[PDB]
Amino acid sequence: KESAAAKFERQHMDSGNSPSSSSTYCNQMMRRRNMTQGRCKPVNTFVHEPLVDVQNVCFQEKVTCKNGQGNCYKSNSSMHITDCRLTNGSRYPNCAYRTSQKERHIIVACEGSPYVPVHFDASVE
Amino acid sequence: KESAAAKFERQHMDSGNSPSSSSTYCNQMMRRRNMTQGRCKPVNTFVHEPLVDVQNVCFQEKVTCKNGQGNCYKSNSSMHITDCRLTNGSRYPNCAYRTSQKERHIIVACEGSPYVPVHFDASVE
Question: For tag attachment on chain A, is the N or C end more exposed, with fewer CB atoms within 10 Å?
Answer without folding.
Answer: N
